[PDB]
Amino acid sequence: KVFGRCELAAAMKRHGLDNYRGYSLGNWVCAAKFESNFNTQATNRNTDGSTDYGILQINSRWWCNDGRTPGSRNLCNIPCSALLSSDITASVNCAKKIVSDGNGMNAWVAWRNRCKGTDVQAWIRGCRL
Template sequence: MRSLLVLLLVAAASAKVFERCEWARKLKASGMDGYYGVSLADWVCLTRWESNYNTMAKNYNTDGSTDFGIFQINSYWWCNDYIINSHNACGINCSVLLSDDVTAAINCAKRVVRDPQGISTDCAPRAGLISRGRDLSSYLDGCGV
């Protein structure tokens, strides 16, 4: 039991809250700038308001689903949390979205945006964040990206 507690504490310690520019550079290096028409500033804005750049962010929804990680990826559509019946379109366990290694989260966000309904399937309409022509350049100010 004691070793389980230590492992849980280590897992929690591996969470990361990115700084804005650090996150912008990570997204750019991962090919997110302009991916399926979503600008780098849109991604930075989206993740700022959805998770405050926190890889361990979780939001429990009234429909029984949960939003996971830095992108707040929903368990009903995109990952399997083994609590609700999931479509699991990203083919992953939701727990991998709660890691400082954001590879799975970025890959799943790319899958979300490729969906016929695009990112609107997930959180954008609720948060009202995808720019739709608004100037979001301030999210990249001073980042050198």
């Protein structure tokens, strides 16, 4: 499923997305924009034969079980398949874990690269919020 921008911001706020750990909604929407471009089914495989799933592209090495990842842990305690649904719950609950694992939002390479130190409030633009 592909979320329109405001519907996703919407969904995130609802899951207590904004200012969570001092990260404003804007940061989250931006992260998802450049991680998966709002597609819940997005997947990227990594050389180390690990995989990134969902809207926030969580890694199978440490966060979810996709089986196939050699030296893997399942810190969120869920099948990587869970992260590919239409409801955001699973991705947001996991993200919450990852965000406070000692690197803030730096965990997301795309956020880091494309959202960090930018006017993120733009991502919440014309949003009935």
